[PDB]
Design a protein around this ligand. Structure first.
Ligand SMILES: C[C@H](CCC(=O)O)[C@H]1CC[C@H]2[C@@H]3[C@H](O)C[C@@H]4C[C@H](O)CC[C@]4(C)[C@H]3C[C@H](O)[C@]12C
Ligand SMILES: [Ca+2]
Length: 124
């Protein structure tokens, strides 16, 4: 679920700021998404959206209000390392891994302040 995704992010990036949650980034981070990602970090968010879209396409998976962000799973954090519980069901596991991969992706990508709260109608 979304709140767990946020938790994974704090796990992989201990120094990230809580207030950042009020903002969006690039063309895909925290947005519906449009155009092409502006940088590596934004690409991580687009890839995450594609991951969720793939999950929804799983005929065997149904999410509350068709929103994968509502799907709670089980995961653990240890020394900035994220682990998805093997006992999550197939649908939850897909989402957990989408979140996990995105969190790791974020931790390695450069953060460009100029892309925070981007003028999407113009650059996306
Ligand atoms: C981890 C990363 C970098 C933080 C830093 O260097 O301080 C930040 C930059 C923009 C952030 C994203 C944006 O704030 C948009 C979304 C806000 C939601 O509350 C969480 C997911 C969400 C998709 C955030 C994931 C993560 O916290 C991002 C990707
Ligand atoms: Ca669940």
């Amino acid at each position: 679920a979304l709140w767990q995704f946020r938790s994974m992010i704090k796990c992989a990036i201990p120094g990230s700021h809580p207030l950042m949650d009020f903002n969006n980034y690039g063309c895909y981070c925290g947005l519906g998404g449009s155009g092409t990602p502006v940088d590596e970090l934004d690409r991580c968010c687009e890839t995450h959206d594609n991951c969720y879209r793939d999950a929804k396409n799983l005929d065997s998976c149904k999410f509350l209000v068709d929103n994968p962000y509502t799907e709670s799973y089980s995961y653990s954090c240890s020394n900035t390392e994220i682990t998805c519980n093997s006992k999550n069901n197939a649908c939850e596991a897909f989402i957990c891994n989408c979140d996990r991969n995105a969190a790791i992706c974020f931790s390695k990508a450069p953060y460009n302040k100029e892309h925070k709260n981007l003028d999407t109608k113009k650059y996306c």
